[PDB]
Design a protein around this nucleic acid. Sequence first.
RNA 1: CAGUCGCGUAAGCGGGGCAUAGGAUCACAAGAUACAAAAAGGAAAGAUCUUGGAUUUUUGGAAAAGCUACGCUAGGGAUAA
RNA 2: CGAAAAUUUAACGGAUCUAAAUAAUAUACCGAAACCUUGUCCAUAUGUAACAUUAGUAAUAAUAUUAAUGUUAUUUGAUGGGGUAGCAGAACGUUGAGUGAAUCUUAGAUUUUUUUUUUAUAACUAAAUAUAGAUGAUAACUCAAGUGAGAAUGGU
RNA 3: AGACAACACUGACUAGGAUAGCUGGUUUUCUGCGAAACCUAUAAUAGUAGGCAAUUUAAGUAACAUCUUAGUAGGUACAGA
RNA 4: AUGUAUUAAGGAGAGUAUAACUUAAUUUAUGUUUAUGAUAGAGGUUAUCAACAUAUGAACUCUUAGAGAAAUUACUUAAUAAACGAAGUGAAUUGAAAUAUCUUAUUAACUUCAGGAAAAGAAAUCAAACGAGAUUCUAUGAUUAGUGUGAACGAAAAUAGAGCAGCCUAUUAAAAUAAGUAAAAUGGCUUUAAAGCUGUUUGAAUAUUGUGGGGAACCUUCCUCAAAGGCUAAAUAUAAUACAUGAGUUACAGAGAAAAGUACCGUGAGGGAAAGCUUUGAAAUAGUAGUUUUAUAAGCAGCUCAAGCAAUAAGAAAGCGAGAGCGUACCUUUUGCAUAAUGGGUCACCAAGUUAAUUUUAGAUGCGAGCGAAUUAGAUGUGCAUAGUUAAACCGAUCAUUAAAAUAAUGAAUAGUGUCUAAAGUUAGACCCGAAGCCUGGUGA
Lengths: 243, 206
Amino acid sequence: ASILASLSDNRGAYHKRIRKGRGPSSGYGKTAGRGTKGQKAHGHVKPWFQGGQTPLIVSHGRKGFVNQFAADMSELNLEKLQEWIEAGRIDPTKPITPKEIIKSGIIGSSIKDGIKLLGRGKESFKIPVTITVSRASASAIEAIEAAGGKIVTRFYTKESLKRLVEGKSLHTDKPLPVGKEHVEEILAQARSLKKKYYRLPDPTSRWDIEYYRDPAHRGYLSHQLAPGESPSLYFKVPTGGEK
Amino acid sequence: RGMASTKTRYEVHGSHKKMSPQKGTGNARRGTRQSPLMKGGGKTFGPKPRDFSTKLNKKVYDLAWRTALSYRYKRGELIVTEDGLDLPLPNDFLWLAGGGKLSRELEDGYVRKWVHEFMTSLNWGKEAGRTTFITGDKRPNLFTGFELAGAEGRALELWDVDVKDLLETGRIVIERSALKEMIEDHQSDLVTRGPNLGEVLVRAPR
RNA sequence: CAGUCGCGUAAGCGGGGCAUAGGAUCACAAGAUACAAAAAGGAAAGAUCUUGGAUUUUUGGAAAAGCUACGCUAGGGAUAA
RNA sequence: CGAAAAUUUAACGGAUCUAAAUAAUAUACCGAAACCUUGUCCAUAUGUAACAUUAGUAAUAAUAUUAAUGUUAUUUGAUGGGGUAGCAGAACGUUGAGUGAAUCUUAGAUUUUUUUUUUAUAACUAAAUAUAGAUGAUAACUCAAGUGAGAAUGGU
RNA sequence: AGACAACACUGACUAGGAUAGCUGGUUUUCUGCGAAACCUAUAAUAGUAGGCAAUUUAAGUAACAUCUUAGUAGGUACAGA
RNA sequence: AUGUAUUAAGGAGAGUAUAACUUAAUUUAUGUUUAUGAUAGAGGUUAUCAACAUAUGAACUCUUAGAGAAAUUACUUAAUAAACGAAGUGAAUUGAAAUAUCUUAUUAACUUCAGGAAAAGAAAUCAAACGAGAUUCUAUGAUUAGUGUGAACGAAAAUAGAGCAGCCUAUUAAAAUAAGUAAAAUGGCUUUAAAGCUGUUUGAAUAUUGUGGGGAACCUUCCUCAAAGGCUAAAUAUAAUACAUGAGUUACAGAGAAAAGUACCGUGAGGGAAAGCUUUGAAAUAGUAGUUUUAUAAGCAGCUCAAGCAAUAAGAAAGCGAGAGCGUACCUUUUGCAUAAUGGGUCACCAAGUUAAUUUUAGAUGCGAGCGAAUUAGAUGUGCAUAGUUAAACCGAUCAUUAAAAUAAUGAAUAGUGUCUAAAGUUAGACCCGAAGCCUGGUGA
Ligand SMILES: [K+]
Ligand SMILES: [K+]
Ligand SMILES: [K+]
Ligand SMILES: [K+]
Ligand SMILES: [K+]
Ligand SMILES: [K+]
Ligand SMILES: [K+]
Ligand SMILES: [K+]
Ligand SMILES: [K+]
Ligand SMILES: [K+]
Ligand SMILES: [Mg+2]
Ligand SMILES: [Mg+2]
Ligand SMILES: [Mg+2]
Ligand SMILES: [Mg+2]
Ligand SMILES: [Mg+2]
Ligand SMILES: [Mg+2]
Ligand SMILES: [Mg+2]
Ligand SMILES: [Mg+2]
Ligand SMILES: [Mg+2]
Ligand SMILES: [Mg+2]
Ligand SMILES: [Mg+2]
Ligand SMILES: [Mg+2]
Ligand SMILES: [Mg+2]
Ligand SMILES: [Mg+2]
Ligand SMILES: [Mg+2]
Ligand SMILES: [Mg+2]
Ligand SMILES: [Mg+2]
Ligand SMILES: [Mg+2]
Ligand SMILES: [Mg+2]
Ligand SMILES: [Mg+2]
Ligand SMILES: [Mg+2]
Ligand SMILES: [Mg+2]
Ligand SMILES: [Mg+2]
Ligand SMILES: [Mg+2]
Ligand SMILES: [Mg+2]
Ligand SMILES: [Mg+2]
Ligand SMILES: [Mg+2]
Ligand SMILES: [Mg+2]
Ligand SMILES: [Mg+2]
Ligand SMILES: [Mg+2]
Ligand SMILES: [Mg+2]
Ligand SMILES: [Mg+2]
Ligand SMILES: [Mg+2]
Ligand SMILES: [Mg+2]
Ligand SMILES: [Mg+2]
Ligand SMILES: [Mg+2]
Ligand SMILES: [Mg+2]
Ligand SMILES: [Mg+2]
Ligand SMILES: [Mg+2]
């Protein structure tokens, strides 16, 4: 009659409740599906126990190690980047930066250690854009430039990527200058902003510096190199000749 | 509330000495006195203070709110009115009650008589289910009237309404502003990207 | 299949022995690999590949002697008075 | 005949049998919860029709239909039927809770009984005794468990 | 005298903190299907693990069982010296 | 049971108007409101026929001066439990299917010291090239990093919430900035080898004009902080009291205690009950009444067949049953039990796969390359998936081995996420009941 007396979940959602130890006819009566007077009836067996035989991880051993220093990139492909532009969820006229890549949803709702642009669906990508990520595959760098776009790989951390979404840090495609001939102009900018903005960090280690120092990755530190110079901070390009 | 509690063999009062010797007395060997097999022993799997609340997706909880609001709409039990939804009690009574001439016994005896005869003429009283008045704010006349005459219906504040309260009476009498705020707070599944929410077709002829 | 060596006119044969009787991991040690390097540059200690020392002989891999007629508890009565 | 053991005839089961023994044959009969036939119950199917409920879709100022679920009947004159350990499905009952400011009750609600009926761990009919207007009982659906005891040399 | 130290002494009584691969018990009904007591490993043989394999219900089937016809492996009964 | 608020020393002996509490054991006064309250009378024992607020007389003995066989002596305006907190000392049961390292466990316990709280506390801190900014409490981070042969043990940064407070001129009176100190060797503790604690023997330096500590062996640059001097409320712990709430209990329940640490037991430490009310009246058990059968018989007392008896009366036969046959209780445990194998005197009640976190699966259902959460304008709050590959990174719809590479070969590629119902793995008492023993603190000649 009443509605509250006529509600119930679909029959497919309800399942039999097995109450053990409640009579022989139930089917779970005396032993309660335990058997007859073993160790599985009286007590509990250790899960890792195999009866005494040594496990294979002790007979073979554990193989390898878990890299605790590797960066956890947020993979992004071109097949998905084109779909967001055709849907109007990413403005191709403006620079596409991690702040606009994280707030659109293309990479998901998790901010990881970086964003790498991959080259899945690089054959049907013909939209000229100006994207800025932490890394990019060789096939994604030339696929972005073949359509008439520009790509730049900057250095980000997990904390700096979070401040970009929070607005506590302004995005820039250039490193912090060095020398006494830049203080007057850099300090000028800070006062004008009239806010406490944080700065984006620049690479410090050898590997991190070298990755953004070569033009193969379109690193934002590549302008510091000469045409004959190599990206590596240790190795040099040998000279060809007889002498 | 989920505050029920019971004492296990590890909480019952007394000493944990062994009752009878392991062998020699001829009776069944017994351990401590707090065993469930003893008179004042503890209940093994007895109730305990825990949390019974479960989870329900905000989108599924909002769909259930608009489904109970549409179940009343199609049956004609959703009667929306204008703002200021209060019982129009007579002015004379309000002048005497506020003044303090009338005692409590008479002030309450009248509200009960008037609310009963007012809801019966409207066919809105106990003889026809009951009614629930949902208003944005607390109004003295309304909330006080349905506190002394509860057999004729009840009154609720927008924040004090559940999906179970819409389905518990014969009719729902809600305010225009209350409804616009009731459906706007439970459209999570709809507002994800809008739809008509309070669009006026015929304006009040001032 | 790739690599590159032997024998053979050639076809071809060769990843020890006519066949059936020699145990891992861990630790440790010697080479290679260039993976990661706890602020950073190095390093240490780790990781992969190859290899070595084992009555690890209870050989799927404990560093290990007895008595109780004063015996105790939980059991079975594989017959034990 | 060989052929002897300790309670008692003592391994025709017994009475008894000259076949009611033995060997080679023949036929009828009896004979199980097996099989058959006529009904019933249960499980799983396959199509169809009808009834009810719920929710849609059309018609109606001079009712029809769609889907789900429940149910009976019927088509293939459908198939299947012991069970421990064990696995699985479907239900009933007990206590409390929501709908419930609901329904019912001196024209007898409720009464640990007795009785009657129904494929029935359950409810129901009637009878007898007592006397309650709710601090009473209660259908249906749903919610949570201190939820079901001939078995522990169990405990009071 | 392993004697006595207040029911207890091969180390008392009392309070606090255990485990038990061993034993016993494990409570309503209806319905469907339905084993094993074998192998391997184990300081293991009263245990346990992995198999074989019972159950649930989905996708498959040139499925599985039996017979017929033609073919194949292998040396028992028997027979022989 | 939880929450909120308040409070911060507890018990006993004897006596007394038996609701009234201290030898004064029912003291004496004020103010206000008194039925429109608050939440035109009778009545001082035939009493307290008045509540709220504020005052007020009295309040014995012991614990508790000294002594002693506590509640006595003898004197006198003699007087402070438990739990909680910090430090010191520091096990064993248990797990590893044995066992030494390890785990149990910076645990239980004991000892000292202190307060209503205590402790801790405004960086010689963390971070990583950007920055954060005292302590305490809760969750996540985290079955993580890491350690360890193993079993297991186990951070920090950061995030969210509760609180928020800084200072030395500390709101209660303290530093002329810290030398036998930092540190080293060695023996231990803690632990990852650093940092930290420590006995013995030794032993530094003086500020970013780069002196000293730290950034997980170690060196260096840089960053970062400034030890050997101090103060500091709150959120936190425990106990008592009061109140609020309840798919908490309603008398073998709740608590051990509806009159209880009482009766009772023990030399002692210590152990420790039963018992509600005027309602209802189950089963077992006992004595009879009605109907019926029974003194020639070898019944797990049922089942199949069934004469007869049984209703004063029209109608209506439940029950008992002579006689014939069939049938060796139940459970557990076993290859197998009527077994002379285990268990039970009967009946009633109590009495066993439950909860939490975590990790999965099926079904149903919400959203959907997103999901979940969470919020005038903007930001904020775990997580999983969206890409695979390798020991690992680089790399990437491609990746790995091929000591150079190369379709030469081989392997791996495409819907998730939340919720409910149910069954589960893991860790907790973990389905229930049951040892002998081991360790610590006490008691007794
Ligand atoms: K199961
Ligand atoms: K058993
Ligand atoms: K003795
Ligand atoms: K069968
Ligand atoms: K071991
Ligand atoms: K680990
Ligand atoms: K150290
Ligand atoms: K009690
Ligand atoms: K009785
Ligand atoms: K139970
Ligand atoms: Mg199932
Ligand atoms: Mg069964
Ligand atoms: Mg089982
Ligand atoms: Mg078993
Ligand atoms: Mg072994
Ligand atoms: Mg004990
Ligand atoms: Mg109890
Ligand atoms: Mg639930
Ligand atoms: Mg380094
Ligand atoms: Mg370092
Ligand atoms: Mg072996
Ligand atoms: Mg072998
Ligand atoms: Mg035997
Ligand atoms: Mg005879
Ligand atoms: Mg048959
Ligand atoms: Mg059959
Ligand atoms: Mg069957
Ligand atoms: Mg009755
Ligand atoms: Mg019993
Ligand atoms: Mg067999
Ligand atoms: Mg065993
Ligand atoms: Mg031959
Ligand atoms: Mg004294
Ligand atoms: Mg004195
Ligand atoms: Mg934590
Ligand atoms: Mg200093
Ligand atoms: Mg030191
Ligand atoms: Mg150091
Ligand atoms: Mg130091
Ligand atoms: Mg200082
Ligand atoms: Mg309850
Ligand atoms: Mg009871
Ligand atoms: Mg006779
Ligand atoms: Mg036997
Ligand atoms: Mg006998
Ligand atoms: Mg017996
Ligand atoms: Mg007995
Ligand atoms: Mg029970
Ligand atoms: Mg990945």
